[PDB]
Amino acid sequence: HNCFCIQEVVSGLRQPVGALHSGDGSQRLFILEKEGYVKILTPEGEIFKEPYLDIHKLVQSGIKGGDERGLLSLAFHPNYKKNGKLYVSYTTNHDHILRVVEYTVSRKNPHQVDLRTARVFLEVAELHRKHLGGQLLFGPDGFLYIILGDGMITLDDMEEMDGLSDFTGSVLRLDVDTDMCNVPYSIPRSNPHFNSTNQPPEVFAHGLHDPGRCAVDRHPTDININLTILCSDSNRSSARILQIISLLEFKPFSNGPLVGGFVYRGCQSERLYGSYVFGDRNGNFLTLQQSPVTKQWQEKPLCLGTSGSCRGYFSGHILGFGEDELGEVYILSSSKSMTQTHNGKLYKIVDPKRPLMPEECRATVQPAQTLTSECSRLCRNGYCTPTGKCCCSPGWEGDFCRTAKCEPACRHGGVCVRPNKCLCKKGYLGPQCEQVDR
Ligand SMILES: [Cl-]
Numbered sequence: 195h196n197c198f199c200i201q202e203v204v205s206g207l208r209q210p211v212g213a214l215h216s217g218d219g220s221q222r223l224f225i226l227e228k229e230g231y232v233k234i235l236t237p238e239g240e241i242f243k244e245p246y247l248d249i250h251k252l253v254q255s256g257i258k259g260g261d262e263r264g265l266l267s268l269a270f271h272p273n274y275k276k277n278g279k280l281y282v283s284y285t286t287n288h289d290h291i292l293r294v295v296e297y298t299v300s301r302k303n304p305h306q307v308d309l310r311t312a313r314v315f316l317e318v319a320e321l322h323r324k325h326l327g328g329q330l331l332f333g334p335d336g337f338l339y340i341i342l343g344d345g346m347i348t349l350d351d352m353e354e355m356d357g358l359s360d361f362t363g364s365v366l367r368l369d370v371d372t373d374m375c376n377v378p379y380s381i382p383r384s385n386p387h388f389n390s391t392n393q394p395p396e397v398f399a400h401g402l403h404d405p406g407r408c409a410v411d412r413h414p415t416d417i418n419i420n421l422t423i424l425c426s427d428s429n430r431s432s433a434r435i436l437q438i439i440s441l442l443e444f445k446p447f448s449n450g451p452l453v454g455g456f457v458y459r460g461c462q463s464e465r466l467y468g469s470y471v472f473g474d475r476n477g478n479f480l481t482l483q484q485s486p487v488t489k490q491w492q493e494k495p496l497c498l499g500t501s502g503s504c505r506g507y508f509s510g511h512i513l514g515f516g517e518d519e520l521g522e523v524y525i526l527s528s529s530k531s532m533t534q535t536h537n538g539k540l541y542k543i544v545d546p547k548r549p550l551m552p553e554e555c556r557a558t559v560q561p562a563q564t565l566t567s568e569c570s571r572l573c574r575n576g577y578c579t580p581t582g583k584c585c586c587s588p589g590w591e592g593d594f595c596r597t598a599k600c601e602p603a604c605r606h607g608g609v610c611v612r613p614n615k616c617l618c619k620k621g622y623l624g625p626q627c628e629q630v631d632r
């Protein structure tokens with residue numbers, strides 16, 4: 195009598211890999227498709243016909259099972275409501291490269307990102323097509339964590355090939371909130387290699403092999419602990435943890451290989467609040483609890499059962515998980531039958547013991563607005579940083595890169611119209627208007 199149940203929410207996805215919201219109040223859910231798409235699902239349950247992001251041309255997907263290449267992850271800037279910034283990680287065309295790129299939603303349309311605004315941050319080289327990782331997330335510190343798998347690169351493979359990474363197998367951590375204009379991302383002071391020119395400054399921890407989706411506790415009440423990141427891993431199946439006030443390798447699981455996990459922070463289940471949930475491909479879930487007393491970890495199983503329309507099974511295999519803005523969680527699934535007809539699916543987890551909309555859970559949809567920041571309206575000739583800093587293209591300047599540069603200057607009422615281009619009035623001639631007619 196303690197089971198949870200599963201509700202189908204949408205079908206007809208193409209090989210979904212996960213889903214998340216954008217923290218802008220709009221209760222939109224962004225569904226990632228592996229071939230390279232992000233679709234929008236409204237709180238009313240419509241899927242928009244135009245992708246929010248369509249980069250299937252840049253991304254090298256993959257056909258075989260086990261071929262982990264495609265769109266990997268998506269993270270929205272913590273202040274996206276204002277700056278319209280998002281970060282994606284995909285694999286593109288030494289087998290391939292794993293980019294991590296910043297994009298900016300379009301200025302004219304809240305529901306489509308401006309493909310022109312790409313702004314690459316990392317490019318990690320890859321020899322194989324497994325153990326990639328790619329999970330992006332923002333901690334409450336405001337920094338950008340990137341969990342990378344070892345790419346199954348050996349120490350052999352690393353010493354006899356220059357142009358590898360030192361990044362693979364690691365949790366990197368960046369400060370995207372830079373005012374600098376010459377390097378894409380700053381580096382946190384707290385980093386365990388700030389300025390150190392031996393081990394790479396981005397790295398914040400390492401030794402991950404084949405991580406799944408990693409649970410992320412943001413400790414809203416817990417004032418002592420800042421962020422905990424808990425990862426399933428194979429190579430057989432084990433956990434790895436990270437707490438912030440360099441990672442520890444236990445094994446609380448006693449069965450097969452997990453897809454990943456999540457920390458439930460929703461409102462609809464009371465019983466489940468704060469729990470760490472992990473699941474496998476076939477939908478056997480478990481919870482993890484730390485003993486306050488001994489700090490040891492225990493798996494309790496968590497079961498599914500039918501309760502009305504809300505079933506105790508779902509079809510296909512789990513590929514990923516999803517969390518909406520209200521904190522409710524989803525399963526993304528597909529099969530070999532499912533994937534051939536684009537019938538991947540989004541299911542919601544429900545606590546049948548509680549109402550679907552308890553008084554405490556109501557919330558008012560705040561419809562996504564056109565980008566409004568100062569930097570967005572004015573910075574034409576360059577690019578904005580997340581902080582509002584306009585970073586001029588080459589040959590421009592001024593606060594918002596509005597005024598053009600000419601070395602040398604324009605003369606006889608000339609006018610520096612675009613970089614090294616003078617408008618001469620009628621009658622002076624030349625590159626800089628320096629010669630007079632006749
Ligand atoms: Cl907490």
Ligand code: NA
Pocket residue numbers: 215216217218219220221222223519
């Ligand atoms: Na949203």
Ligand code: NA
Pocket residue numbers: 413414415416417418419420
């Ligand atoms: Na805190």
